[PDB]
Design a protein around this ligand. Structure first.
Ligand SMILES: Oc1c(Cl)cc(C(O)(C(F)(F)F)C(F)(F)F)cc1Cl
Length: 134
């Protein structure tokens, strides 16, 4: 048993709050915000050795990242930002920082009861997205 066991699996979005405002703060344009805000993604998390894979799949976009904790990688986001990403575990929370154009946003994933809670923060704007097991 190990580092991310309680995150592994297939998760489905069940609620969102403040996501349009988060996307605005990040710089996402109108049409992408509308279509992305409608999305109901599945988040699929797996681990093989030290490599964690996170897939996000919806009618809007299918994306996938694989990474080792603490080890930076280049990522193209679903909104076509080219970012430098680092994901770490901080007291049981997966913390994903994305850097681009002198900006930064942080996405935190936490297990809470039977949910996986995702908090997306850009400056003073936070969005909370709740996922349940599929
Ligand atoms: O699945 C998704 C993933 Cl991985 C990422 C996004 C975004 O890139 C966000 F919010 F992260 F900035 C954006 F901009 F399109 F909204 C949205 C969905 Cl729905």
């Amino acid at each position: 048993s190990h580092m991310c066991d309680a995150f592994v699996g297939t998760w489905k979005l069940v609620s969102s709050e403040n996501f349009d405002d988060y996307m605005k703060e990040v710089g996402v344009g109108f049409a992408t915000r509308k279509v992305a805000g409608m999305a109901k993604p599945n988040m699929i998390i797996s681990v093989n050795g030290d490599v964690i894979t996170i897939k996000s799949e919806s009618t809007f976009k299918n994306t996938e990242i694989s990474f080792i904790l603490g080890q930076e990688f280049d990522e193209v986001t679903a909104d076509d930002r080219k970012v430098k990403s680092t994901i770490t575990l901080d007291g049981g929370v997966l913390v994903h920082v994305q850097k681009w154009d002198g900006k930064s946003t942080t996405i935190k994933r936490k297990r809470e009861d039977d949910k996986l809670v995702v908090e997306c923060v850009m400056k003073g704007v936070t969005s909370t997205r709740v996922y349940e097991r599929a």
